[PDB]
Amino acid sequence: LAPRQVLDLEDLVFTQGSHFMANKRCQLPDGSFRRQRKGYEEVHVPALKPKPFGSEEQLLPVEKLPKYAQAGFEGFKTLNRIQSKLYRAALETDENLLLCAPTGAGKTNVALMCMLREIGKHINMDGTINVDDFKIIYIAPMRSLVQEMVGSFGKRLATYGITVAELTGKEEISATQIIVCTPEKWDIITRKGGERTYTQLVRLIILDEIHLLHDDRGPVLEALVARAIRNIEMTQEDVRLIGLSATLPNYEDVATFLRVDPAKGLFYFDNSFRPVPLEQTYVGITEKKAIKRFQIMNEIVYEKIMEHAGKNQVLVFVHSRKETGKTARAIRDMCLEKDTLGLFLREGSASTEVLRTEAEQCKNLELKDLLPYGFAIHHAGMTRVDRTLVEDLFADKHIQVLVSTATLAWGVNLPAHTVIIKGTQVYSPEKGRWTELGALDILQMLGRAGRPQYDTKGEGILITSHGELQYYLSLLNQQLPIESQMVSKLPDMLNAEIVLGNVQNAKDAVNWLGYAYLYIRMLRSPTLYGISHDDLKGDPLLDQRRLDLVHTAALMLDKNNLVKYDKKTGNFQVTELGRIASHYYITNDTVQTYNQLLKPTLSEIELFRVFSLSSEFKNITVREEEKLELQKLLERVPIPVKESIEEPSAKINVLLQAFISQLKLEGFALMADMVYVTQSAGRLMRAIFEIVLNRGWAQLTDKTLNLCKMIDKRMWQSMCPLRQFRKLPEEVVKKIEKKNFPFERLYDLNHNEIGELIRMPKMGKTIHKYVHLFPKLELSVHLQPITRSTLKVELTITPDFQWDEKVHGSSEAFWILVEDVDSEVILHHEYFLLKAKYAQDEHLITFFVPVFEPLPPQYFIRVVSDRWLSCETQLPVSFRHLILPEKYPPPTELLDLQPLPVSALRNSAFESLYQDKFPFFNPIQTQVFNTVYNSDDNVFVGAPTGSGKTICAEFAILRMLLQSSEGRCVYITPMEALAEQVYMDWYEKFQDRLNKKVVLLTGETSTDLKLLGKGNIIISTPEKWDILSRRWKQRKNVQNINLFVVDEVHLIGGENGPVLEVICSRMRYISSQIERPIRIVALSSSLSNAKDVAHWLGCSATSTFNFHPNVRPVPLELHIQGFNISHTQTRLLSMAKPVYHAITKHSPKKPVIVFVPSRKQTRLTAIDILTTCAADIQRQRFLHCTEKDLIPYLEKLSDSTLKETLLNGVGYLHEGLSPMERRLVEQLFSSGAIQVVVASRSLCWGMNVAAHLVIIMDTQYYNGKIHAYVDYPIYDVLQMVGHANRPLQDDEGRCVIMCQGSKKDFFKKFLYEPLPVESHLDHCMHDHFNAEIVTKTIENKQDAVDYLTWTFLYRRMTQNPNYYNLQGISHRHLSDHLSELVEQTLSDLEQSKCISIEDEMDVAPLNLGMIAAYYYINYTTIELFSMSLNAKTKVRGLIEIISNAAEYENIPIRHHEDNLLRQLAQKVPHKLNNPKFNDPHVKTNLLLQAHLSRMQLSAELQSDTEEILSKAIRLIQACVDVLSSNGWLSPALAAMELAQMVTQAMWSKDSYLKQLPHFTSEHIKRCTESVFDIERNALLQLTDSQIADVARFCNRYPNIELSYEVVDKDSIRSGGPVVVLVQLEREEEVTGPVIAPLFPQKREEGWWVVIGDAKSNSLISIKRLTLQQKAKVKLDFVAPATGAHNYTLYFMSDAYMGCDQEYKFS
């Protein structure tokens, strides 16, 4: 709150812009002499004599400059004078430079030296250069110069393998190192907020012709540099700035502006450094006289040209493309007439080069007229090849007199000897007037006088008007001061910075102005900028003036609603109009106009008028002279121009229409105006489109999008779409149009019929081709009801057309529009990008759409091309048969009970777990307390995450221990992480203090059964408890449990939810058989339908407590921030600053958790938060302890970056970190030492920590399998929001959710409101049905139908039938659908040979079904095994086969991982045949080969390898079973060897010594071979700790002896049973489990005793066991005849290599 004054900006602004002079006088050098010709005044400024070298100045040969930089300098012997003074500064220092030189001084090679300096850092090994490690930006003021420089730098840097490209005219430019472009282009790019995607890699910025600061375009430069500098401060990344300027006053302020050290990087060269000394002639015209003004100019021109009439070149600059033809024509038109003036400057009156200029005449246009006589023309466009030919022919210095336009001076380098500029008057469309030419143009033009290698002295002449034009004299003689035009453009600039989020308020804006050139200029010339010496003395830093300017601009932006700004706080709030305004580069008055006139019902007439009213056009007016032509155009343009007579408005309208109709024009001012309106047209219309699209106005969205496309394609909607193909003849198309036939119908005609219909058969084939090149999409929909208000839509987009790289490029963009029945409203919309490589792949787009209870017949889904005209597909979505679900019952009302005390629990040993922490239970806990603690009946508690639902389950547990001391309780959590957290908490709370037994179920079965036996409290995930309790008939400990607790039961609606549902239903089923109730306690998030889950689990209406999300003990303040960006990387980057703003606004001093999509995003967001904080001049602001205190803990960290961020008070959490590291970060965060932690989404279940503020960065994650982004499960988000809960510390929790705009409303709905859930079990049926058939719970079809009655599914099917695709809620429909389900499931199971179906009723388990059910493996997996396995299968084939298991289907493919898997593919022993690298099976294969080969990989691949190796064993054992069941010897035992070598990480053929720890590839050389051989270990390297590991290895590794007998050798014979008895004994007590350090989940040894014939390759008998101490093994098999043959007895492990044994017998 500081005093603010409203300024009048029009008072402070410089009106003349570039034409403005701070100059009082102008001092003329040496000979000033004036010659008065009475028709004009002539002022001569002579050339400066060439300066002799100074004492230290010398030329610097290319050999002297650095080795790596010599390339690109071929063609240049040594450096230029200027460049020689600059070479050390450019190449050998990183200092910011400002180079002031005469125009044409060759400042270019200096910039190239700066570039080469940047390149020199990247030298690398023998990679030659690093293309992707850096980017360089070259900003040039003119487009022509941009292309010239792209060419030059391209040629010069070609040897370094570097791409130079032009950005000004859409992504893909990401592959380009040097981006050349205009200030406004780069400003537009860096405004986007995803700017960082471009600028993160930028190490260098070169501002060319920076004196443009004085020009009206200058503020753009100021904004650019300000933005970049603040970015140097904010990112801490150093970015070098090189300014290049003409020699003019104030340049030192430019150096300051650019952060240049005046004693280091500032270089100024006066006019004596001009490469060709210039004799200057300044002509000016006395009076305004009529039309003889022009004849005066031409008379001047003639007299001054003729002084050169032998070898000399003259270049004349004129202001119109017509004036080129008129002036070159005019001297030949004038002159000659008098004694053939200057005739034959064609050298020899014969044919020297005359034959060459007369031979090129066979060119076109007016070129042919002037060319035989040394003459030519250069003007803007309309020539082609001819412009080039004028250039090359003028270049060999034959064309003598060349008349041109400034575009030549800017576009290509061809200096002449003499340069004449005519009149200095140019038409300005934006001013709508005729004004005096821009300073930059004059400089670059006159800069062409004299030829560097061909001229000792140059000459130039500037003809102009007399008055107040001493200005030019000021300009060329280095006296014209550079000022700041910033005051003019201040509101649009300020708005841009507000939209980027760089200024959040007035103070930030003042500080922002501090970086502007305006600031310095105001400081050093205060009177000029309208500041009193008094004001300046009292306020040297100009706080008052900056604050006042900011105040005025803010009021302007606030008026037009680009920004909400309150004068009290001074804070800025971005609006959408401002956001679009900054993005689409529109002035604030125009956005306000649009805001006024835009409405859904706006007609097209009205639209064109609104476009005409854009303030970009405010100075355009209708001249008398153009009226007639306008009239003609209006008669020819299609859209009615409403009641506007010839106003500026109507003129603009018709000019745009005329541009679309491609009508040719004559009037030149009119042509200029049209170009001006059409350049802006696309942007303005795209802006309008964005406005109405995001307001959801369907008609106007349609109109506006079409208008964008029409301006782009220069055609009306009415015409034929084929026009959009540019290589097609236009009269063919007009013939097609003349036929009043639909374009669509052309799809169904063969090319014969095509050529036939058009009576032009010759084109018939080609047309056909293009017809099928036209983008076309097929649309398929799948509709699932969610709530009465909400529907789920799966939209399948199928491309139908041929892709062409020429036509479609790399991609094609579409808008998915979901509109209501009237097509007046867009209910949902999103951007869909079809990539070329991924075309022909099917695209599944999922979203939700709102509906309203008086349901319409249908909605409409239109997919419309973003570019192509008349490209669309519309699909009706029919509601006729739609059955909305039942509305949700009210939540259980939360009563305010007295906050029941801990003493209400009556036990002391119980109360001691609580009283220390809290005096009382919360309202939810007290309300449910009586029910849960006192009764035994089943109970459901719904409540938001963080309501403390946990200790209700704990009430129940305490009661179970109260009733029976030996009682057994099983607790299930969907997530393993949660399971371990609960395990820690309750191990302390029960096993330690209350001294009960607390166990945690693991992967392995046997040890788990044991844990089930001893445990009082048993913690498990659904899968473990599933593979356990499947055998429940046979396992008593499963049958008897007093208490069953399920937490987060709403996860039944998520992935893996079917298993939760199955085990819960099985527990209910079990409960009814023993008529001893198994109590069931279910905890959940607020459910829209509690009632269904309650009926399912046996909860009474009173024992069911389901609470609304607003009763959450810590009240939630939820804020949802939409971002409209369709490209995720860009969105994240645009989210970076809003995150920091969220921290500092909502939780400045209190803890903050920030969830981000991926591992890498954790580090990046942490670093952004860090550096931004520090750039607020507040560092450690997030560190609430002293750095000194942290050092002792941080000494234990391996990770460097984690140390640095923790040191700044910000930690982060991802899976790559060690448990120690994670625990460290969590402990520090909980303690309050660090205020901020940034965790990946995968850890949201695995974090025990809480915050005051939770920020969710984006909502989506990348799926590499489908090549698309997918939404966070609503469950993960619920969890994340729950992590901001702090009942003790905070009076409120706070959450800020950041997301793509299309998702925004979704989170406003299902966060605030309770969550509807459904059962996906019906798609998971097969494994469970197979399982229950094996255990004989299901013996027939009726048993399956009955089994289904225990599921949540059964309940939901009548509540939301259409979700499960039931067409009715009648009991008939239910029975029918269920029967259909069991029939299909059982059928699929029979076809897979898992089960056998008998008598159409009964079912029985088969072998494969038993195998799958036993090892807990998907049935398709073992089916696949049975199909792909044969007698000749070996190890490699086995790996390929096991890699294809369905268990590995969910192995993730991450972003940009295809390259890494491609690299891994060549590094592995078994090359894979035609692999797809987004295929998870290919990945698991490669990773298996990697694990075997001891390849260490990236962290991600390592975690993946872990998840694979997890399920590897059961898969392999399944292969063993299957192989033996088919009677194959060789493939078996190979499977076993594979099990071994998977456990111990070794290959087929390999050292057995590789199993011992602390062995490398170097050691084996001296080992020349068995753990059995281990005479002094002194053979090689030993450490006593390493000695401990090896000695520990050998006392475990099996030492086993085996006896065998064929019982009664002789009494067995012909046909009868044979029993081979084997006896196993080991000479050591087994200690510890298997040790396989490289195996993630340590397994226990098991052994196969196999009997088989090695000749016929038959496995006659097999058995698997665990040894214990010693073991008896009975192998029984049937005998062949003539009883005596040769057999083999194998003894194999699943773990170790080398323990394998063979015994031959008979």
Ligand SMILES: O=C1Nc2cc(=O)n(Cc3ccccc3)cc2CN1c1cccc(OCc2ccccc2)c1
């Ligand atoms: O962002 C999203 N994430 C999700 C996560 C998730 O788990 N599910 C499954 C699920 C959801 C709730 C309960 C249980 C299971 C679904 C989504 C869908 N979703 C989304 C995406 C695009 C658009 C959209 O508009 C919705 C909308 C718009 C306007 C008015 C009303 C609604 C929504």
